[PDB]
Structure formats: C-alpha cells, structure tokens
Amino acid sequence: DVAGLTPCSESKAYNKLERKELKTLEKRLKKYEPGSAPYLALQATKERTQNRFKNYAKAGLLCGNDGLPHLISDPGLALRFNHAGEVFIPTFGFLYVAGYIGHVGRQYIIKSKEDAKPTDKEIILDVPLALQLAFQGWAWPLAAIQELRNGSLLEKDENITVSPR
C-alpha cells in the first residue's frame, strides 16, 4: 500500500483491463470455427493473457488508479515490502552480465595488444581465444577488484595521451 498504490490482486482497474482484453480476444475468437489454426492461435493468446494477468498478481505488484502495475524503486523500501526483485535484483543481474562483457573485452584487448599488428587481431577475431575468455569470465568481479588492488586495472596518467591545455 506504499506510494498510495493498491496491490494488483485487490485492485479494481486491473480487473477492468483484464476483462477488456479477454473481451476483445473473445470477440476476435468468435469469428473463426473452433477446429481452425487461427482459433488455436487466439486461444493460446487468451491463455497467455490470463496467465500473465495471474502471474502479475500474487507477486507483490502494485498499481495506481489505472490497473497498470508500478515498480517500487528505492531499495530498503523494496526490501521491506517484498519488491526487491522488481528493480533491485534485475540491476544486480544486469551489472553481473555487463561486467562479464566488459571484463571479457578488456581481457581480449590486453591479450591481443601483445602480438605484432594488434589491429589485425582486432578486425579478424581469434575465435578460440574469444571463446576461452568467454568461458573464463564467470568470476569477473573478483578478478576486476584484484587488478584494482594490484594496480594493473588503472594506467598512470604519465603514460596516457593528454590533450593540450
């Protein structure tokens, strides 16, 4: 009941939206014979709509004055009101995947800059090396913070090209 938002299970406009979608799906369904492929496709669409409307309920979702679900944003408020999985956990998973991609790219750049003509390796990928680094990045945050600790993650400003003042 936070932010003046009713839960989707106890909401009123949520049910109106569900009935409206089921009504237009049934209106589209009534134009076809029961033993037809469009009938089966529309029945599958109606079943998916009902399952989505049921699964959006009984999960702590809140909607305000329109039946459209709202996402609780602040952690702590989301943690104490069963809304952590709305945005708190998805950004944790996204940060994991984004750090995976960044660490794999960093490892490929560092390992490809060692050999002669690194631009050829950049534009013609070493597929076994890329796949080896792809399956070795499952522990990207530990490795990243350890390179931060030993200083190999950062480059000294004396060795970095600097625009004139």
Partner: protein, 73 residues
C-alpha cells in the same frame, strides 16, 4: 510518466551540459587542434586536412547546444 519525463529532462540537461563543457574546456586547445586559442572563438574550420575539422570551435559547440537546449525546453 512524470518520472520518465523528468528523467528525460535530466538527460537533456546533462547532454546540453556535456556539449557546452566540451566546447568550453577544449576551447583553447585539443588533440585535433592544439592552437585553438590562436584562432579565436568563432572560426569555421581548419580545412579537410587531418581527416576533417569542421565545427571544431567552441562557437560551433554552442550552436549545437542551442539545438539541444531547444529540445530540452
């Protein structure tokens, strides 16, 4: 929707600020144009040399940021 449009406003402010401070900080020099202080504030370009140098002055950065400010407002 109010939160989404406020975040879009924040995007507009941040991008216009980015253009304006890129123009201001690189006004007197840059990697492409180290001697930008000797060419004044409002000069067209340096020609097609070094890959192309159009809209390199801080005045042109301001003139792009006018578009971005118009979009933000």
């Amino acid at each position: 929707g109010d939160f989404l449009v406020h975040h879009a406003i924040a995007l507009g402010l941040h991008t216009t600020t980015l253009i304006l401070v890129k123009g201001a900080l690189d006004a007197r020099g840059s990697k492409l144009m180290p001697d930008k202080k000797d060419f004044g504030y409002s000069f067209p370009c340096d020609g097609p040399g070094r890959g192309g140098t159009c809209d390199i002055s801080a005045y042109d950065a301001f003139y792009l940021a006018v578009f971005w400010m118009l979009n933000t407002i």
